[PDB]
Ligand binder design. Structure first.
Ligand SMILES: NC(=O)c1ccc[n+]([C@@H]2O[C@H](COP(=O)([O-])OP(=O)(O)OC[C@H]3O[C@@H](n4cnc5c(N)ncnc54)[C@H](OP(=O)(O)O)[C@@H]3O)[C@@H](O)[C@H]2O)c1
Ligand SMILES: Nc1nc(=O)c2nc(CNc3ccc(C(=O)N[C@@H](CCC(=O)O)C(=O)O)cc3)cnc2[nH]1
Ligand SMILES: [Mn+2]
Ligand SMILES: [Mn+2]
Ligand SMILES: [Mn+2]
Ligand SMILES: [Mn+2]
Length: 159
């Protein structure tokens, strides 16, 4: 099973200038809990944005060019990325925009954080057809002293 996990600001913005400009510790904790001990697939731009391997996960990087770091697994196509994960129950695709576009048709589950923040950005999460997805979990949180915007965690499953 393939799942996508992402955090979206208003208008589905996910990034600006290869960065995420907000800081929401509760969302990073949600990301860690839902990805730990699973393989994570990311594109090369997101690998450069993160800047180091994510511990406790098999890190698979999609790039057309040879890898430059043997602490992670480099693959050259979607099918190779999937095969490199092996026979696991759940593969997590962690972006960025172009990678989400390629895996969305193959995904059964979306883990989305909706952040109430207006962000100039240059990368968006793909348009997804709402009729194809059922919301199976949602949890709203107001802003607090650690998290400066309100946010909504949602899990959607393909119908
Ligand atoms: N808010 C969130 O949840 C979230 C999550 C992830 C990322 N982001 C943000 O998203 C932005 C990066 O997204 P992006 O769309 O620019 O880049 P991306 O999807 O991270 O990376 C695209 C790169 O991945 C490689 N790639 C993708 N598909 C491939 C394929 N089928 N075969 C081979 N290589 C493939 C290519 O690398 P080569 O050029 O090396 O071939 C391509 O240029 C940043 O702003 C980051 O902060 C946000
Ligand atoms: N919901 C969500 N939030 C994100 O921030 C996010 N980020 C990415 C890509 N970027 C990043 C950037 C940093 C870290 C990171 O530092 N993660 C640590 C934090 C653990 C914690 O804060 O408790 C990790 O071990 O996962 C992960 C992904 C992909 N999907 C996401 N999905
Ligand atoms: Mn092929
Ligand atoms: Mn197999
Ligand atoms: Mn949203
Ligand atoms: Mn806000």
């Amino acid at each position: 099973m393939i799942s996508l996990i992402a955090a979206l600001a208003v208008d589905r913005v996910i990034g600006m200038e290869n960065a995420m400009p907000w800081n929401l510790p509760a969302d990073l904790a949600w990301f860690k809990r839902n990805t730990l001990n699973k393989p994570v697939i990311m594109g090369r731009h997101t690998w450069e944005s993160i800047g180091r391997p994510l511990p406790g996960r098999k890190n698979i990087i999609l790039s057309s060019q040879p890898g430059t770091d043997d602490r992670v697994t480099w693959v050259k196509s979607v099918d190779e990325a999937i095969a490199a994960c092996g026979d696991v129950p759940e593969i997590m695709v962690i972006g960025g925009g172009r990678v989400y576009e390629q895996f969305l048709p193959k995904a059964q589950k979306l883990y989305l954080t909706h952040i109430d923040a207006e962000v100039e950005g240059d990368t968006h999460f793909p348009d997804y057809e709402p009729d194809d997805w059922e919301s199976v979990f949602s949890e709203f949180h107001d802003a607090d002293a650690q998290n400066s915007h309100s946010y909504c965690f949602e899990i959607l499953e393909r119908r």
